[PDB]
Amino acid sequence: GSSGSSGVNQQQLQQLMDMGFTREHAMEALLNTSTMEQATEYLLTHP
Incomplete structure (x- = not known):
């Protein structure tokens, strides 16, 4: 069937x-x- 990734x-x-x-x-x-990784940074940049 159909399957994949949607949004975040x-x-x-x-x-x-x-x-x-x-x-x-x-x-x-x-x-x-x-x-x-990028995500981490974003968060790491916003504790």
């Missing part, structure tokens, strides 16, 4: 969110960014 990704989201962040930034982070 919980993985990264949760992954980061776990580190101790806010879903708000987390989400935007990913959205803004593209890869996981």
Whole structure:
């Protein structure tokens, strides 16, 4: 059947969110960014 990825990704989201962040930034982070690493930075730049 049909399957793939839609919108952001919980993985990264949760992954980061776990580190101790806010879903708000987390989400935007990913959205803004593209890869996981990038996400980290975004968050790392917004504690």
